[PDB]
Design a protein around this nucleic acid. Structure first.
Ligand SMILES: Nc1ncnc2c1ncn2[C@@H]1O[C@H](COP(=O)(O)OP(=O)(O)O)[C@@H](O)[C@H]1O
Ligand SMILES: Nc1ncnc2c1ncn2[C@@H]1O[C@H](COP(=O)(O)OP(=O)(O)O)[C@@H](O)[C@H]1O
Ligand SMILES: [Mg+2]
Ligand SMILES: [Zn+2]
Ligand SMILES: [Zn+2]
Lengths: 267, 377, 281, 623
DNA sequence: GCATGCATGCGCATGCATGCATAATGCATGCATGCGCATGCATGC
């Protein structure tokens, strides 16, 4: 697709606002030492207090709580910019960095029983116990192939959940050359990331007496794979989104709602 | 069902006319032969029999005529045994009024008129559909007796309530109903021309027995109807058009845009043209044995009186050219050319001329074109 | 694809995909309703109905409530699908349901209370009000009244707590009007549970925990003690209790909490109940 | 409602205004010249309504300027929004007619037709501000198509139970029922065209004759649509005035698609036709009706005719700005009157030419061209051709195909448009033999025969020819004879009724008179009415005295023209003498031709050719 | 110079290769849960 965007006032202004938020030169901020600690520890994500952001810039906090995905993208872009600024060498290792959230969310502090469609597409906080966990599985991101017949190597890029909706043109594994010469997959050069799924239930101590419990399903990405175990009391902060069903003609009109974690805390 | 009062009364009165006022029984006796389909009825007999019936038929010709056809069919069926497949038609001759070609207007559509004209062209004869039979391609239902009028018309809708098919049908030609067909062109005569105007041209249509007559170059009177037939490429600009009364709107993804919306509402362009259907064709002004038989006793008396006169050589010279003075030699030559000789053929395959050709050369003003004009007249 | 494209090549068949992030969503719930036992015909199985709840009608009803519902009687519409299963007798039957439109569940008073409580004679009035139909036992009635009012709980900086509720015992001969006082207490208190030893007909005295094998969820069943918080529990037949309940009630009475541990789970439940027990010789 | 959306028109106010005006209006300036057959002292339009009741014509004609004189608001509202104003006028008139004359039988109610909107502007000056407004046109009709039937009410029949319904057209579209009314079947209703109701339509093409002309503007063609009774009220070659609305229509991209073009088309919807003109003579339409109510004018003209010198007076009144050549003007007047149109079909001879063809042969330095221009501008149905500019196919008729519709097989030429009119041919020498071949038949048989592929027809070309010619050397060389100077075939020359040999005598009195007249250069209605009355009210006939005078003139002419060098005589000259005598009889308003007319015709014939001064045995003109 | 020949020129019909427009229904699979069975653990007397 050759379509590109030239100007966008909102996105550029939000990126500038986050750039000013994470400067910490004329202020008593600490995020600079946090970034230096991340570089020292080879980790690739940051946790930022929501109350701190609201104190410094209330409008940005309101927009981020009300709208998650675009603001999170702007955060990640700003992190990439400042990591490049402080030490451009370290930013080469990882594609993109991530943002965690922390602080008192207030009204959005929501129990698994009180999660509703009113909080869709926003960042929510939930307290619960872990009941089901699944095995860690790798997922392909970048694929590399070699052709012994013509001595040529090719690479294909994959982006499935990066974009909201995917199409059959993507997510196709190449196996043959343009002249039907067989290709040999080379697993060393490819790129994979880990994936896990967990389930969280409202704690029996908090649930009303005599009533059945209610649960939420969470997806854990590459960094947060081993941070949870069954039978554990945790607090999860993350986005609440709908799940796109696969292609079909007739739809009943009922989506599946899945919480995508950004921060997992052992209370 | 719903019936028509005027049609029933016209049927009853026309049956009374055919049974009471009998030449028409004698003509129905001839109607047995397979080459005859039409009954010829004199209109003065209708006028004498019932002025009310005559006025009703004149003011309601198109609406009543098919029912008179059924009455005639019942009459011939009662009088004789004829297979039900054959059809029959009615004709009228002696209208007491004439109408000029330009006097034909939209108010006269459907009534009985009589005009005069000159034939210019005749097309070949073809069979045509009258009432068709169709088979539905989805539910295999048979639909019979669909009227074609003046266009190839399919059934409006499949008669099965659940099917509702209006686009896919097959035609079974074996069960269908046919009629002969021929097209002719006529032109307005010179005597009817107004100032600085080109003669008007009209199309005439002949069905079944009347197809034979009206050869090219004739100067004939027609009696029939004036009927409207649709046309295609008349409107380069949008005009009057049809649509459906149902209050139906589109849905997202199937919005009634231009082409799809026009096709969904069944929009058709209302374009039309004027066409004349003829039921009676006559000469404007009317095998030696046949010619002798055609002439009446008084005409034959006149012919015989002319035959045995020597002055026929002289008097014919003066009769055709009364005003031209002298030049009797040219008059005699022109008469001899008019009568002509006898053509013959030889045994070797050659042919010999039987016609005569005449040339006139003269000084100016010697009445040279008067002979040409007199022979043309 | 409804786009005018002349000169351009055209889109294929069935080219549409649903975008999930650009949709408006609302809450959805289904309920199961049973015929009232008060009106079920004799010797006939009860009938059932399915209810649809949208938006703000959700979570307004808890299972076990007696409700009156106003709605629209409808059928499901998911296309003209073919019948399934090995039984195909029924022809042209659409599952029916009810679309719920309305639900009903079956400071001057403060001025009056403040005016009343200021009197010095309120003690006698309250003592008289406590079961006036019962002869004698004025001291017993006053003890029941102060039971109903209850004490005050006090947490401490060390994290230790001290009980703020009152526990009473009544031992006596049969026919001494003990059960009637317990029933009056159960009715009088804003929250009250009346039980015997060994629990009740279909409810235990203490809570229990199980694990659902199909979908792994830790379910807890409400007991007679857990179902009450800040209420009064009247207990007949104190002698018939089983061993497990007898051991648990020690902690329930002392520290007002119950502790249950099973494979992969450890939980502590709150039970802040006043105890009013009766027993025989 | 007080006002109509997009306008300021009130219905009741305009209705009352029109009803009052139909009773109140009186104009003193309109004398008996145009207030014809009406008592002027009485209101005019009420008298018109009374005359309508007398005759029963369902149509009334209203002049706009009278309404403007009564008030300006009504005039402006009628011009701006004809659609909201005219229907009110119809009912306003109908109520008055039915109240004053109850139970008068009519087939339909009264419809009002405005006329004479004051606009003297070039049509190219029209602007979008004037879309859907009332305008006037003065022009000539060249093409009229056949009638088109257009539907107004559709007839539907139920195919299942024979139930029949009628649907009236609304907003130009017909909505056919999708469900029956007695069996409730869907889509069982079929449309039958012949049972429906239709109306007539006609398309006309008109050639503009603007009063104001910019620099370098080509001629214009205007498309008009005429409906109902207005059909067949005009014929090609007629010069008319038209009043109608100005429209705009979109054009389809191609016939098979419904897309329309952005640039709109244009046309004019005719409402009113007028034939009267204050500069040209009366047409044949008004002559065929009894509209000579002006008995005062009739008496005045009949008294004038008895005066002796009126003939010369007419020759004086034919052209005020033209010189002493009285013989030429007398010949042109006799041409205007024309001979009697006898009927000879019973004889079998064919048509007999009853008109007058004249030739003027002279040097270019004369006034024959001005005479042709004046005759062209004076008489309706006039055409002008010049030399090689026209071709043989340009005259008569030519094969065409419509640029708007499929076909228009034949289209008339210059000569046919001149039917019952005058054709002026200039530079007759330069015309090729191909066109002279056509002229040979046109000038005598009054008919044309065309035989081409699929086109065999005979047309009427009853025209009168005024031809101009020059000497071969552009000088009248006296050494050469008349025939050598003219250089035309005798067959073509014999058909001319009069031949005028313009010659320069170089007389001093002529020079003085012409110089004085030309430097000094630095009743028409009575003449028009007299010419129309004489042309439409009298049939000349002659007695035996005129017969013998004509025979004597013929033999004398044959004796004189026998000698070579001069133009010889032929029997057609006798018929020319007859036609001139009949025209002179018409001039005197006499049904009987006297010997005076024959003698005058002989005198004109002798003087036109200058045979008196010409030397009979050498063919050389002398002075 | 006038009479004739004629190479150029224009508009509307059909024939033929490419190109354009259309367009839901039936069958299969995995998740939830009842019903019969044998082992085994825990609880009395
Ligand atoms: N012999 C004659 N008898 C009667 N009329 C004649 C005679 N000769 C000539 N005419 C008149 O003279 C005219 C001759 O013109 P026309 O015959 O057309 O000449 P051409 O045919 O040579 O061109 C006719 O109108 C005719 O009436
Ligand atoms: N003092 C009293 N006043 C009123 N009713 C009494 C009194 N003593 C006993 N009764 C009646 O006797 C019955 C006592 O039965 P119950 O209270 O169940 O005995 P227990 O509590 O010992 O099992 C009650 O129904 C009560 O109506
Ligand atoms: Mg001739
Ligand atoms: Zn069907
Ligand atoms: Zn019906």
């Amino acid at each position: 697709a050759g379509t590109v965007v030239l100007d966008d006032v909102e996105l550029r202004e939000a990126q500038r606002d986050y750039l000013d938020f994470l400067d910490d030169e004329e202020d008593q901020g600490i995020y600079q030492s946090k970034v230096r600690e991340l570089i020292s520890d080879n980790q690739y994500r940051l946790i930022v207090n929501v109350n701190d952001l609201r104190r410094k810039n209330e409008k940005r906090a309101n927009r981020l709580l009300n709208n998650a995905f675009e603001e999170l993208v702007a955060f990640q872009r700003a992190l990439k910019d400042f990591v490049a600024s402080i030490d451009a060498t370290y930013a080469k290792q990882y594609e993109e960095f991530y943002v965690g959230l922390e602080g008192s969310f207030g009204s959005k502090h929501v129990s698994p029983r009180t999660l509703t469609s009113c909080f869709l597409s926003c960042v929510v906080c939930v307290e619960g116990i872990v009941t089901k966990c699944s095995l860690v599985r790798p997922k392909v991101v970048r694929s590399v192939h070699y052709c012994p017949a013509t001595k040529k190597t090719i690479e294909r890029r994959y982006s499935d959940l990066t974009t909201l909706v995917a199409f059959p043109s993507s997510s196709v594994y190449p196996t043959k050359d343009e002249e039907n010469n067989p290709l040999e997959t080379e697993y060393g050069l490819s790129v994979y990331k880990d994936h896990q799924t967990i389930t969280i239930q409202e704690m029996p101590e908090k649930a009303p007496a005599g009533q059945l419990p209610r649960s939420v399903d969470v997806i854990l990405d590459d960094d947060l794979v081993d941070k949870a175990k069954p039978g554990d009391r945790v607090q999860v902060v993350g986005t609440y989104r709908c799940l796109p069903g696969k292609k079909g003609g007739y739809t009943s009109g009922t989506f599946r709602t899945v919480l995508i974690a950004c921060n997992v805390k052992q209370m | 069902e719903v019936r028509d009062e005027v049609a029933e009364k016209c049927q009853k009165l026309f049956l009374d006319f055919l049974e009471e006022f009998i030449k028409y029984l004698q003509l129905a006796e001839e109607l047995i032969r397979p080459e005859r389909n039409t009954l010829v009825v004199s209109f003065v007999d209708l006028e004498q029999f019932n002025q009310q019936l005559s006025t009703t038929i004149q003011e309601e010709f198109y609406r009543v005529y098919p029912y008179l056809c059924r009455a005639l069919k019942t009459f011939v069926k009662d009088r004789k045994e004829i297979p039900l497949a054959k059809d029959f038609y009615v004709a009228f001759q002696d209208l007491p009024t004439r109408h000029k070609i330009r006097e034909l207007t939209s108010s006269r559509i459907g009534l009985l008129t009589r005009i005069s004209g000159q034939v210019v062209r005749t097309h070949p004869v073809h069979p045509e559909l009258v009432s068709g039979t169709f088979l539905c391609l989805d539910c295999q239902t048979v639909i019979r007796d669909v009227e074609q009028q003046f266009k190839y018309t399919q059934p409006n809708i499949c008669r099965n309530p659940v099917c509702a098919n209006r686009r896919r049908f097959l035609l079974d030609t074996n069960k269908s109903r046919f009629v002969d067909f021929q097209k002719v062109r006529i032109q307005e005569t010179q005597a009817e021309l107004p100032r600085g105007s080109i003669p008007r041209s009209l199309e005439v249509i002949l069905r079944a027995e009347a197809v034979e007559s009206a050869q090219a170059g004739d100067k004939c009177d027609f009696t029939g109807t004036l009927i409207v037939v649709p046309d295609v490429s008349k409107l380069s600009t949008p005009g009057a058009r049809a649509e459906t009364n149902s209050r139906v709107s589109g849905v997202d993804g199937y919005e009634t845009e231009g082409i799809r919306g026009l096709r969904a509402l069944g929009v058709r362009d209302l374009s039309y043209r004027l066409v004349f259907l003829a039921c009676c064709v006559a000469p404007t002004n009317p095998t030696a044995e046949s010619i002798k038989n055609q002439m009446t006793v008084k005409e034959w008396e006149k012919v015989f009186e002319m035959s045995q006169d020597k002055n026929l050589y002289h008097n014919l010279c003066t009769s055709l050219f009364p005003t031209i003075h002298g030049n009797d030699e040219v008059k005699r030559g022109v008469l001899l050319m008019l009568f002509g000789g006898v053509p013959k053929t030889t045994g070797e395959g050659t042919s010999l001329r039987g016609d005569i050709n005449v040339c006139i050369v003269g000084d100016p003003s010697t009445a040279k074109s008067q002979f040409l004009k007199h022979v043309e007249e | 694809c409804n786009t005018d494209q002349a000169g351009r090549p055209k889109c294929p068949l069935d080219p549409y995909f649903i975008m999930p992030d650009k949709c408006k969503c609302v809450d959805f719930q289904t309920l199961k309703l049973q015929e009232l036992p008060d009106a079920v015909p004799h010797g006939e199985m009860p009938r059932h109905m399915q209810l649809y709840c949208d938006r703000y009608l959700c979570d307004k009803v808890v299972p076990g409530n007696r409700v009156t519902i106003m709605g629209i009687y409808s059928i499901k519409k998911f296309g003209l699908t073919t019948s399934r299963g090995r039984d195909r007798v029924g022809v042209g039957i659409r599952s029916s349901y009810i679309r719920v439109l309305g639900i009903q569940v079956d400071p001057q008073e403060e001025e009056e209370f403040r005016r009343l409580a200021a009197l010095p004679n309120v003690y006698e009035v309250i003592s008289k009000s406590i079961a006036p139909s019962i002869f004698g036992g004025t001291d017993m009635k006053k003890a029941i009244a102060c039971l109903l009012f209850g004490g005050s709980r006090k947490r401490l900086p060390d994290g230790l707590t001290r009980r703020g509720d009152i526990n009473l015992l009544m031992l006596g001969d049969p026919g001494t009007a003990k059960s009637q006082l317990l029933k009056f207490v159960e009715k009088c208190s804003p929250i009250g549970v009346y039980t015997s030893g060994k629990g009740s007909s279909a409810a235990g005295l203490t809570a229990s925990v199980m694990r659902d094998p199909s979908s792994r969820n830790f379910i807890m069943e409400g007991g007679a003690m857990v179902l009450a918080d800040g209420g009064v529990v009247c207990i007949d037949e104190f002698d018939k209790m089983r061993e497990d309940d007898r051991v648990a009630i020690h902690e329930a009475m002392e520290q007002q909490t119950i502790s249950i541990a099973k494979a992969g789970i450890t939980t502590t439940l709150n039970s802040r109940c006043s105890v009013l027990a009766a027993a025989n010789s | 409602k007080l006002v109509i959306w997009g306008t300021d028109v009130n219905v009741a106010a305009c209705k009352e205004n029109f009803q009052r005006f139909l009773q109140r209006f009186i104009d003193p300036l309109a004398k008996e010249e145009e207030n014809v057959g009406i008592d002027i002292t009485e209101p005019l339009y009420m008298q018109r309504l009374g005359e309508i009741n007398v005759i029963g014509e369902p149509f009334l004609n209203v002049n706009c300027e009278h309404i403007k004189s009564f008030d300006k608001n009504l005039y402006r509202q009628l011009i701006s929004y004809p659609q909201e104003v005219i229907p009110t006028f119809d009912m306003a008139v109908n109520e008055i007619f039915f109240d004053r004359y109850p139970d008068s039988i009519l087939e339909h109610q009264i419809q009002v037709r405005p006329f004479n909107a004051l606009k003297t502007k070039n049509m190219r000056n029209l602007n979008p501000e004037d879309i859907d407004q009332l305008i006037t046109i003065s022009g000539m009709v060249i093409r009229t198509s056949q009638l088109i039937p257009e539907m107004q009410e559709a007839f539907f029949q139920c195919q299942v139970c024979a139930h029949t319904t009628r649907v009236e057209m609304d907003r130009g579209r017909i909505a056919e029922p999708s469900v029956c009314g007695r069996c409730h079947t869907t889509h069982s209703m079929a449309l039958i065209h012949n049972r429906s109701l239709f109306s007539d339509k006609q398309m006309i093409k008109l050639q503009e004759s603007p009063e104001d002309m910019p620099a370098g503007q080509t001629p214009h063609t205007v498309i008009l649509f005429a409906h109902n009774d207005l059909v067949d009220k005009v014929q090609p070659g007629d010069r008319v005035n038209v009043t109608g609305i100005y429209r705009a229509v979109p054009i389809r991209v191609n016939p098979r698609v419904s897309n329309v073009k952005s640039v709109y088309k244009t046309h004019i919807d005719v409402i009113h036709y007028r034939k009267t003109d204050a500069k040209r003579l009366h047409g044949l339409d008004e002559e065929a009706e009894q509209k000579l109510f002006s008995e005062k004018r009739v008496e005045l003209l009949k008294e004038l005719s008895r005066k002796p010198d009126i003939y010369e007076r007419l020759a004086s009144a034919l052209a005020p700005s033209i010189y002493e050549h009285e013989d030429i003007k007398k010949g042109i007047l006799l041409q205007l009157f024309g001979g009697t149109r006898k009927d000879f079909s019973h004889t079998g001879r064919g048509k007999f030419r009853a008109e007058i063809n004249i030739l003027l042969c002279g040097d270019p330095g004369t006034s024959k061209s001005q005479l042709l221009q004046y005759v062209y501008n004076l008489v309706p149905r006039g055409q002008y051709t010049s030399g090689k500019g026209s071709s043989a196919v340009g005259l008569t008729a030519y094969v065409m195909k419509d640029p708007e519709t499929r076909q228009l097989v034949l289209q008339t030429g210059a000569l046919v448009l001149s039917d019952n009119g005058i054709c002026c041919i200039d530079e007759f020498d330069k015309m090729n033999e191909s066109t002279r071949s056509v002229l040979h038949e046109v000038m005598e048989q009054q008919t044309l025969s065309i035989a081409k592929a699929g086109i065999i027809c005979q047309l009427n070309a009853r025209t009168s020819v005024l031809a101009a010619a020059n000497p071969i050397e552009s000088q009248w060389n006296p050494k050469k004879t008349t025939i050598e100077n003219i250089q035309l075939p005798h067959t073509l020359l014999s058909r001319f009724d009069l031949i005028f040999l313009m010659l320069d005598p170089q007389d001093e009195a002529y020079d003085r008179r012409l110089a004085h007249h030309l430097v000094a250069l630095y009743d028409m209605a009575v003449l028009k009415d007299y010419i129309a009355y004489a042309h439409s009210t009298i049939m000349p006939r002659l007695s035996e005295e005129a017969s013998q005078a004509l025979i004597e003139a013929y033999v004398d002419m044959r004796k004189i023209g026998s000698s070579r060098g001069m133009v010889s005589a032929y029997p057609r000259q006798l018929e020319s003498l007859i036609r001139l005598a009949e025209a002179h009889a018409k001039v005197r308003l006499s049904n009987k031709v006297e010997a005076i007319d024959v003698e005058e015709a002989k005198r004109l014939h002798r003087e036109a050719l200058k045979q008196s001064a010409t030397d009979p045995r050498t063919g050389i003109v002398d002075i």
